[model samples]
Target: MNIFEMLRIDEGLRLKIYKDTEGYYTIGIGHLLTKSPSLNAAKSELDKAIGRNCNGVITKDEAEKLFNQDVDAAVRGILRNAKLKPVYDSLDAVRVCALINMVFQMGETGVAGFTNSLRMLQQKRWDEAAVNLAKSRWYNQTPNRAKRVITTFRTGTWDAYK
Candidate 1:
């Protein structure tokens, strides 16, 4: 069986795909990656996948209203491409958001502090790279958010919803 089948991709008559702006990816915690329709649709898909909701998208409006400005996977993957990996490779986990969820929040600049932090990371000044995190407007407005994210910077481990 395939991975989907192995995991039992379907439950009943329900359609599993949630047509969000991001198309069909599952939603993460904090619903940060999702807006309203995604949460509803993903929840529906999750339910249908597991055996619960059994609804279908009846019209384009239903589908469109279900989602908005889907997750930007293209933009999301750009940073890790060969050209940009150097910007983050040597950097710590904090001042960060490398994993799937965090990327949804900051886009590109959110991953690194700013141009200077990216430069610091490129130069291999790990300490300075993180230091730049605190110096950002992001750091000022969301100190707790910054602290939590920065705490996870070095490892690049998956952590978010702060």
Candidate 2:
């Protein structure tokens, strides 16, 4: 919920190309496909989210506001995830933040696929959970990103990957 963590995530995810699981031409954080139906969806989503387009110029205040609204769902997602765990309160902010980042990337069903990792986390098995995360298809798809997330979980620090 801190600005630094949000900054770090924005750095981690960065601006990328391709369709998200839900068919959004996602870029930046978790922008969904533009409801406008144009291939220029990314541009349109930014305009809709920010109240003005202006070639996607985002000020600090605009970014802060967008990130708050963006992370609000992520925060709620973490709370829902916490409900299923036995060590909810015991989990550090980094681990919780990592999960939120994962949820942000993959959505709930995507996050749900990490059964072993989630189970190990619920059991407070940090080492095992890290390993489990490493072995996931997500890891195979993006080793560096997964390494960052796994490092955060294993070491309880946000910049372990960096």
Candidate 3:
């Protein structure tokens, strides 16, 4: 599957404000509103994104738009990191989606912290890369998603879709 479809499956859509696994206020396919510091600010930002006085509720279209925007930001965030660029550019489209999904789930900085895993990926050492990823705390926190991503890294396939 494509990155967008994979993310939609992983994040799931929410038209109303909800707490994520980490208990942060999130909406619109894992768009983290709590990044604004206060609940009120998060609600305000959500309203602005939907271009309406949503009062915590948004339409599916608005959610989709927000999801697209978040995905774009994740993509840009990955590319903007100089250390990740070369490794990113060297991957196939399927593997690239796996990397992008990682950035989508955790911020670019979070993924960038995987120094050894990044090096394994850069060297095209698929098994080593997967091993490195499997040993991370991120893998423990979200085993199902992390397993799919690690499998993608190992096999360069759309494991999320299957």
Candidate 4:
């Protein structure tokens, strides 16, 4: 499956605003309203995405549009990392998606802090990379999602999606 499909499953569709695990105001496939530069900008974007003043709600089509934008940003975030580019280029689609998924969840800076895991990934040491990821507070905070991502890294396959 593609990154969009994978994320659709992992992030899940939410038509209404809700607090994420981190207590951030989030909506429509993990779009963090708090991350927006300003309240007006966020509100305007929300209106644009939902085709109206959302009032904390969205539609499926609007949600999909927002999801697409978020995924684009996540992909860009991965590509913009100089240290990650070579390793990212060397990986197959499945492995690449695993990395992108991490970036999508935690942002590039957060994922970049996994130096040992990234090193292992660069070396194609799947098990070591997975092990390194398992040691993180991220894994503890979101065990199920982390497990799926770790498994994807370890297997270099879409088995995790299955």
Prediction-by-prediction clash tally: 10, 0, 0, 0
Quantify all predictions' global Cα lDDT against the true fold. Answer: 0.43, 0.64, 0.86, 0.84
Largest lDDT belongs to which candidate? 3
lDDT score of residue 55 within candidate 2: 59
Model 4 RMSD in Å is 2.4
Q: Candidate 3: where are CA atoms >4 Å away? A: 36-38
C-alpha positional error of residue 114 in candidate 1 after TM-score superposition, expressed in Å: 1.2
Clashing pairs in 1: 21-70, 22-70, 92-153, 92-154, 93-152, 93-153, 93-154, 94-150, 94-152, 94-153
lDDT of 4 by residue, 1-162 (tens): 989988888889898877677766678898877765455666666776667788878888878888898999988887899767766976788889889899989888888888888988988999888988998999999999999989988998888789
Please list the residue runs of candidate 2 whose C-alpha ends up more than 4 Å from where it truly belongs after superposition.
Answer: 1-3, 6-24, 27-38, 53-57, 81-90, 159-162
- For model 3 the local lDDT of residue 63 reads 85
Higher-TM-score candidate among 3 and 4? 3
* Total colliding residue pairs, candidate 1: 10
Which segments of model 4 are wrong by more than 4 Å?
35-45, 48-51
For each candidate, what TM-score against the reference? 0.42, 0.71, 0.93, 0.89
Task: Please list all clashing residue pairs in model 3, or write none if there are none.
Answer: none
Expressed as tens digits, the lDDT of each residue in 41-120 for candidate 2 is 66766777767763544555665565567667765665676443333455777677677667766666678667777878
Query: Could you list the CA RMSD of all candidates, in the order they appear?
Result: 10.9, 4.0, 1.4, 2.4
Could you tell me the C-alpha RMSD of candidate 3 in Å? 1.4
**Cα deviation of 20, candidate 2, in Å:** 8.1
Q: Give a tens-digit lDDT track for model 3, residues 18-113.
A: 877777789988888876557788889788777778898888888888889889999999899976887798789889988999998888998888
- Sort order, TM-score high to low: 3, 4, 2, 1
